[PDB]
Every structure is written in C-alpha cells, then in structure tokens.
Design a protein around this ligand. Structure first.
Ligand SMILES: COc1ccc(OCCc2ccccc2)cc1Cc1cnc2nc(N)nc(N)c2c1C
Length: 206
C-alpha cells in the first residue's frame, strides 16, 4: 500500500500555459473559483459520511490563498515544502514531497479512521505541478482554459494540450466531465470580466 489511488491535477491556465504572475492569478473569475471549490469538494453520496477529498499544494500556493480561505474547507489540506517550516496552523499538514504526503495521508486516514480519503487533488504550484506530471499515479487533469494570453510569469510545466503530447493526453467528452464531477457543468465558452474560458478534462493511461 501507498499507491492505491490515482491523483488528479486541477489548474486554470492560458492558451500559452500561463498559470500565475506575482504569487497571484492575473484574473479574478468568481465562477471559475466556484467550479474549483465544487470539483475539489465533491464526494459521491453513500460515501459522504466518512469521505473527504484531499488538496495538495505547494507553500507559495498556500501563501497565495487569502488567509480567510485557508485551510480550504471541507477538504484535507496538505502543504508540500522541502523545508519542514513551519506555519501550521489550524489542524494542518505538511510533507516534503508528493510521495511523503501520500504516505502521511495513508498513515493518518486509515481504515480505522473516522475520516476516510476520497479523491486526491494537486492544486498547484508550478513546482508541484511538475512533480505531479512526473508521478506515475497522475492520470487526470481538470483544466480551465482561459482564451487570452494574459501576461504571466509562472507557467504550467508540460504542454499537455499540444500535438507533441496528444498520444498521451486525451481530452474527454463533456458528458464524461459532468459525470466525473457529478453535476451539470457549463459547456463551451464562459465570459467573466472580458475573458472567454472553458472547462476541460484530460486523461492519460497509467
Ligand atoms: C489565488 O488562488 C486562490 C485564490 C482564492 C481562492 O479562493 C478560494 C475561496 C473563495 C471562495 C469563494 C469565492 C472566492 C474565493 C482560491 C485560490 C486557489 C485556486 C483558485 N482557482 C483555481 N482554479 C483552478 N482551475 N485550479 C486551481 N488549482 C485553483 C486554485 C488553487
């Protein structure tokens, strides 16, 4: 045991693979954020007495999130940092890598435990995205594609939507996206604050 479950990466990015600027996101999309909350939060139903999803994130993403929203509620938060800091505080959870995080989670949230783990999401940092992309259990990318090359200075590390990666990563039908996420999701382009964007789900075989 340690690799029972696959990982899912969730990310909002520009057609240039832009994901961030200054330790923020150079867009403010309140319906996007709300999709993120619903996806990372949703647990199939018979399960939802025991079950919680996990969000894994890098230190600077943790720092990036406005203090009033940390830890992300109704999810198990784990911050991944090669320098066991710290910063705690409210109950929460550090590991020096993706695999140390998974080991900590499996130790902490066992069959015995009152809380059980449902799905595990990597929610960013560029650096943790790169670790997740290299991990043999990552098989799923929930991507919000922002159709505007907004200036960014932090980039998603692998062009998964590009021709070079297209025998590995496949974009799924929208009905399958709605299935996975268990609700209606808007199809096609959405316009908030002068940006068109759309939700995609991509997968690869393990
Ligand atoms: C600065 O990154 C923020 C900033 C604020 C924020 O607010 C959550 C609380 C809230 C609730 C209700 C309204 C407003 C705020 C969450 C994030 C992380 C985020 C956002 N979209 C995200 N979207 C995608 N596609 N992927 C992510 N990984 C992601 C991630 C990590």
């Amino acid at each position: 045991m340690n690799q029972q479950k696959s990982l899912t990466l969730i990310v909002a990015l520009t057609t240039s693979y832009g994901i961030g600027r200054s330790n923020s996101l150079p867009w403010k999309l309140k319906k996007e954020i709300s999709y993120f909350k619903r996806v990372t939060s949703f647990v199939p139903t018979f399960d939802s007495f025991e079950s919680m999803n996990v969000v894994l994130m890098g230190r600077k993403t943790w720092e990036s999130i406005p203090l009033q929203f940390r830890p992300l509620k109704g999810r198990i938060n784990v911050v991944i940092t090669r320098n066991e800091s710290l910063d705690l505080g409210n109950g929460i959870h550090s590991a020096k890598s993706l695999d140390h995080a998974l080991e900590l989670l499996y130790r902490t949230y066992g069959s015995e435990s009152s809380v059980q783990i449902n799905r595990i999401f990597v929610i960013g940092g560029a650096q943790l995205y790169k670790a997740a992309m290299d991990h043999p259990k990552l098989d799923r990318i929930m991507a919000t594609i922002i159709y505007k090359d907004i200036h960014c200075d932090v980039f998603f590390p692998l062009k998964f939507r590009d021709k070079e990666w297209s025998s590995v990563w496949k974009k799924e039908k929208h009905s399958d996206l709605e299935s996975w996420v268990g609700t209606k999701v808007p199809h096609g382009k959405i316009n908030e604050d002068g940006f068109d964007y759309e939700f995609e789900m991509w997968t690869r075989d393990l």
